Design a protein around this nucleic acid. Structure first.
Ligand SMILES: [Mg+2]
Ligand SMILES: [Mg+2]
Ligand SMILES: [Mg+2]
Ligand SMILES: [Mg+2]
Ligand SMILES: [Mg+2]
Ligand SMILES: [Mg+2]
Ligand SMILES: [Mg+2]
Ligand SMILES: [Mg+2]
Ligand SMILES: [Mg+2]
Ligand SMILES: [Mg+2]
Ligand SMILES: [Mg+2]
Ligand SMILES: [Mg+2]
Ligand SMILES: [Mg+2]
Ligand SMILES: [Mg+2]
Ligand SMILES: [Mg+2]
Ligand SMILES: [Mg+2]
Ligand SMILES: [Mg+2]
Ligand SMILES: [Mg+2]
Ligand SMILES: [Mg+2]
Ligand SMILES: [Mg+2]
Ligand SMILES: [Mg+2]
Ligand SMILES: [Mg+2]
Ligand SMILES: [Mg+2]
Ligand SMILES: [Mg+2]
Ligand SMILES: [Mg+2]
Ligand SMILES: [Mg+2]
Ligand SMILES: [Mg+2]
Ligand SMILES: [Mg+2]
Ligand SMILES: [Mg+2]
Ligand SMILES: [Mg+2]
Ligand SMILES: [Mg+2]
Ligand SMILES: [Mg+2]
Ligand SMILES: [Mg+2]
Ligand SMILES: [Mg+2]
Ligand SMILES: [Mg+2]
Ligand SMILES: [Mg+2]
Ligand SMILES: [Mg+2]
Ligand SMILES: [Mg+2]
Ligand SMILES: [Mg+2]
Ligand SMILES: [Mg+2]
Ligand SMILES: [Mg+2]
Lengths: 68, 97, 155, 114
RNA sequence: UGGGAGAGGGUGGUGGAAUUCCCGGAGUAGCGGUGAAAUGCGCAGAUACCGGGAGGAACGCCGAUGGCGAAGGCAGCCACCUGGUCCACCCGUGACGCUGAGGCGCGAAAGCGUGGGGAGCAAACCGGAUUAGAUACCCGGGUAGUCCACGCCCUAAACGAUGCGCGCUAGGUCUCUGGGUCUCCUGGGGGCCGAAGCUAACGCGUUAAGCGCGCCGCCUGGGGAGUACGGCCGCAAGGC
């Protein structure tokens, strides 16, 4: 069920695109591992950097409670 | 109570009592020294002091060898101390996990 | 023991009731392999429990057995630096044994002078939930109940 | 008196405390391994959490409590058991959210935790 | 001349999680802590829960057998200043090279001076346990310090226990980062397994501990001893 697949062409450096980005967060809000995003090394680094900027802006969470 | 055997040797009540005095070093650990037995013997190369003692947590069995009888009695005591202390503290060894 | 489980010995039924259990309980009355005497005392007791209570030895005895069966017990297991009393369910084999052992034991703590009487009585009292044997079961059962907290520590 | 509220389960390796609040967050009642009757390390067990969650929920129901939201903090033994008990209590349990606090590498832990 | 990756370095800003303390609320009989306890805290209202505030410190997930640096080391995010390095083009210089006694610089932590700062942690220190005893380990406290600026100290299992540069000697596989005709090939880096060969063995093996040249540093039985004396450095501790 790798995320990279379930999306079309997108910008990895685009930090305002919350709708794309928010899919790479665990339901707890954490940045997802390479094994779940299907990203390579080089791309995954660009991801994490722009997710972090995004949380700074208010668009993405730093943490989310776990519901059951 | 404490019993001493002198095998193929003549020993004095003095030497006997000196053994009681060295053995008391074991009372340090504060546990019941039950029917301790000391055996003294003269091998070709020096004297031998053997002892067998039961305590609530086990048995002390050990033997000293030295050209000098007094020195062997002491080496006996060391071996006995080490065993007795190993008895008294080995149980504490695994309170975690 | 170490290799495979133990096999419960099948007892020979008693010739006054054909009952596997009266056998076992006889045996627990037996000192020094003197089984005949052990039967006498038992059977004598039954005579008594018939006389003093007009109903069946067998029916009575079998109750005082069910009433002394411990359902739970504590068995010890050192964890860390404490010896915990763990609560455990008792297998019916052990339940029986305990019941029989205790019945005899409780009875032999009684003051009446003749072995036959004491048995008769302990059984009477236990069929009615009274007496040392039942008291052993409750102590044992309370003990296990109290230690309910350590139930997950069980093997 | 209030019909719906919150149930917080503070579950640590030594203990379980459960406090029941109102919807706004203010406590109505609370219990723990200590209140249910144990001292020492027994407070930390699942059976401890159980009596604590029951006795906590039971006292609440007598204030008219009926539905609760369950909040869980800690990774103690008697955690999951504490949750069982709230469900089995006679209380509704609309939700169960785990909000255990974890730092994003903050203060240096005590030595025992390194 | 085009490009690239990176926790490389310095400065300035700046975000959320958590801990602590304070304020407000609500609530009551315990909390905490261990192998089990006790000290400790708590009806003078603690713990647990909600809202507000204060302050310092470290940046969870991403995160890796990853990356960068000569080493020590370097990790939230943003901008500025700045080093190293790799690739492609095969355009310029024309042996301008290698190493390097001295010298100079940098150098974890602890420590030191002057001034800040101080939430958490914590040498010393108090107390509770454990224990035969327990100047410890475990528990409750706790001051330097840990943090910032500036100046010192100059050590280390500062390790790959492996000095630097060059050339030569099978490959297999995993990986980071480039450039391709992008199946695959070609560089630069990080691991594993191995040809030859080495090696006392263990193991090493195009990241050599193989085969060779250059230069440097070092060893020559254990202890005494990294001690003494001397000299040089240092505020001292102490260093060479
Ligand atoms: Mg012998
Ligand atoms: Mg015994
Ligand atoms: Mg009895
Ligand atoms: Mg506890
Ligand atoms: Mg308050
Ligand atoms: Mg009052
Ligand atoms: Mg608050
Ligand atoms: Mg040219
Ligand atoms: Mg050079
Ligand atoms: Mg030099
Ligand atoms: Mg330094
Ligand atoms: Mg420092
Ligand atoms: Mg310092
Ligand atoms: Mg200072
Ligand atoms: Mg002390
Ligand atoms: Mg003491
Ligand atoms: Mg102490
Ligand atoms: Mg301490
Ligand atoms: Mg502290
Ligand atoms: Mg303080
Ligand atoms: Mg000072
Ligand atoms: Mg000082
Ligand atoms: Mg190393
Ligand atoms: Mg290196
Ligand atoms: Mg060296
Ligand atoms: Mg050199
Ligand atoms: Mg060399
Ligand atoms: Mg490549
Ligand atoms: Mg390419
Ligand atoms: Mg490197
Ligand atoms: Mg390579
Ligand atoms: Mg690496
Ligand atoms: Mg190899
Ligand atoms: Mg070979
Ligand atoms: Mg290779
Ligand atoms: Mg060699
Ligand atoms: Mg020498
Ligand atoms: Mg010196
Ligand atoms: Mg030195
Ligand atoms: Mg000098
Ligand atoms: Mg040196």
């Amino acid at each position: 069920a790798k995320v990279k697949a379930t999306l079309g062409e997108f910008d990895l450096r685009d930090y305002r695109n919350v709708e794309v980005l928010k899919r790479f967060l665990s339901e707890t809000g954490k940045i997802l591992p390479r094994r779940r995003t299907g990203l390579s090394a080089k791309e995954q680094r660009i991801l994490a950097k722009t997710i972090k900027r995004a949380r700074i802006l208010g668009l993405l969470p730093f943490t989310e409670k776990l519901v059951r | 109570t404490m019993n001493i055997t002198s095998k193929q040797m003549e020993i004095t009540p003095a030497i006997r009592q000196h053994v009681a005095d060295r053995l008391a070093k074991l009372e340090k650990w504060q546990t019941h020294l039950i029917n301790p037995h000391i055996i003294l013997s003269k091998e070709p190369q020096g004297f031998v002091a053997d002892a067998t003692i039961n305590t609530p947590n086990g048995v002390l069995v050990a033997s000293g060898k030295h050209e000098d009888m007094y020195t062997a009695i002491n080496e006996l005591i060391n071996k006995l101390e080490r065993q007795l202390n190993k008895l008294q503290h080995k149980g504490e060894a695994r309170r975690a996990a | 023991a170490r290799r495979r489980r133990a096999e419960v010995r099948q007892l020979q039924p008693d010739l006054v009731y054909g009952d596997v259990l009266v056998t076992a309980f006889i045996n627990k009355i037996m000192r020094d392999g003197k089984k005949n005497l052990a039967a006498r005392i038992f059977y004598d007791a039954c005579k008594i429990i018939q006389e003093k209570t007009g109903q069946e030895p067998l029916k009575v005895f079998k109750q005082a057995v069910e009433n002394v069966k411990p359902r739970m017990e504590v068995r010890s297991r050192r964890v860390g630096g404490a010896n915990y009393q763990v609560p455990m369910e008792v297998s019916p084999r052990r339940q029986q044994s305990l019941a029989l052992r205790w019945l005899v034991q409780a009875a032999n703590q009684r003051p009446e002078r003749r072995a036959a009487v004491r048995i008769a009585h302990e059984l009477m009292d236990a069929a009615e939930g009274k007496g040392g044997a039942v008291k052993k079961k409750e102590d044992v059962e309370r003990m296990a109940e109290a230690n309910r907290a350590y139930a997950h520590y069980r093997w | 008196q209030v019909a719906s509220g919150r149930a917080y389960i503070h579950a640590s390796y030594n203990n379980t405390i459960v406090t029941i609040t109102d919807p706004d967050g203010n406590p109505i009642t609370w219990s723990s391994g200590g209140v249910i009757g144990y001292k020492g390390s027994r407070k930390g067990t699942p059976y401890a959490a159980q009596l604590a969650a029951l006795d906590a929920a039971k006292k609440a129901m007598a204030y008219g409590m009926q539905s609760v939201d369950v909040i869980v903090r800690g990774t103690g033994a008697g955690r999951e058991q504490a949750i069982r008990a709230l469900q089995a209590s006679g209380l509704q349990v609309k939700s169960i959210v785990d909000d255990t606090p974890v730092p994003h590498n903050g203060c240096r832990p005590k030595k025992k935790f390194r």
